[PDB]
């Protein structure tokens with residue numbers, strides 16, 4: 296008989312899951328497995344992202360229970376648990392979605408060896424990305440395209456990405472009963488209190504496949520909005536109704552299929568011939584993801600500056616004070632501190648909001664290394680993605696993909712264009728709520744009487760600016776020019 300394990304790492308969904316469909320074929324028992332390490336905090340992970348994962352696991356559990364099955368959350372490391380459950384469960388096949396991150400390739404190779412020793416067939420279909428990333432490299436002549444323009448050309452020669460896989464059957468082969476490693480008390484989904492977090496999560500975005508599909512349909516409720524979407528023209532100050540999809544946390548964990556997103560986009564584009572085109576279209580946004588996945592997976596030390604062949608080596612300063620002020624949202628620039636507060640409380644900010652705080656920390660004002668800011672984003676972002684995080688920080692720091700170091704965002708003027716009254720600032724910085732909109736982006740310029748009648752004295756209730764933007768930006772621009780020479 297066939298006994299299979301479907302191993303969830305990413306791809307936390309039932310729809311468009313060719314690994315799950317293969318595991319359930321001609322099977323007498325299927326074991327849906329996630330592997331949880333109960334010491335991940337004894338080694339930089341916010342409760343926001345971790346609880347989002349836990350809610351995604353709880354959604355998978357309800358989905359498997361509705362099909363007569365059960366999600367098994369095994370505690371330990373994969374290389375120490377799988378050889379045991381291989382023999383205990385009489386496993387003949389192991390299925391999981393392919394993953395191209397550096398740690399995944401080391402982990403998965405070791406598990407592939409352990410499965411060969413136990414006589415277990417390993418099936419690893421591709422469904423986290425739109426295409427086989429290695430296939431794109433081979434059709435490009437053995438090299439990853441290094442520009443978005445050439446990447447869009449390659450994927451248009453390849454053609455449309457594969458269609459999403461069909462839905463799994465309404466009933467699934469259940470786990471075998473009375474297997475000691477599948478006992479309910481040891482295979483259940485823990486709470487954020489049980490993994491060790493003391494402070495509660497504060498994000499407003501719930502995890503799970505069910506929420507991801509609900510948010511997918513809400514975005515496609517207005518097909519004219521989807522067809523005319525232009526990413527650079529969207530508002531970074533909208534928080535009640537964000538200006539983009541906020542599907543990034545669901546695409547990172549795999550709660551939403553990228554190929555289903557793409558298939559729904561083409562359906563809209565067929566009936567709107569004046570739809571936006573890459574790179575600014577909504578399809579273009581999925582291609583930025585596909586672009587950074589393809590270059591990143593084929594570039595050594597992609598997440599670092601030293602030893603990275605695509606990243607320029609810049610003489611980044613080591614100022615712990617500036618990084619701490621940026622990290623703790625006490626820079627004195629309300630637009631900057633508001634976005635950094637949204638990072639810690641929501642775990643998500645608009646793309647142009649991330650532009651403002653990343654340029655400020657790096658080539659714009661403080662000249663701190665992009666690796667130090669990427670470490671801050673990696674902790675708090677609920678959509679933290681290894682390749683997308685590193686590639687965009689190199690872009691914003693003008694270390695790779697981007698070279699125009701004379702374009703420096705003003706931490707004062709940028710948000711005023713979208714939000715003159717400062718509604719975004721007042722929401723996340725309540726200390727500056729009664730400050731007149733004339734000084735809300737520059738509170739240090741308000742007369743003391745205004746600061747006192749607003750309950751916000753600079754230096755007492757809200758910090759003074761750590762730098763003068765006019766002085767800091769010119770110096771950073773001059774040092775960036777010497778580097779590019």
Ligand SMILES: Cc1cc2nc3c(=O)[nH]c(=O)nc-3n(C[C@H](O)[C@H](O)[C@H](O)COP(=O)(O)OP(=O)(O)OC[C@H]3O[C@@H](n4cnc5c(N)ncnc54)[C@H](O)[C@@H]3O)c2cc1C
Pocket residue numbers: 526539540541542543544546547580581583584585587644645646647649650653672676678679680681683684685687688691
């Ligand atoms: C410094 C910095 C760090 C970033 N780190 C991350 C990260 O860790 N994880 C992450 O998902 N994105 C990251 N981004 C990219 C981008 O800002 C987010 O993908 C976007 O804000 C997500 O919002 P959305 O889902 O509403 O996007 P939409 O505009 O609705 O786009 C749809 C999807 O396309 C993809 N996408 C959109 N923009 C980009 C982009 N610039 N690069 C790559 N893929 C993109 C995402 O999967 C996104 O969900 C980063 C950008 C910057 C400037």
Ligand SMILES: [Cl-]
Pocket residue numbers: 703704705708709
């Ligand atoms: Cl600007």
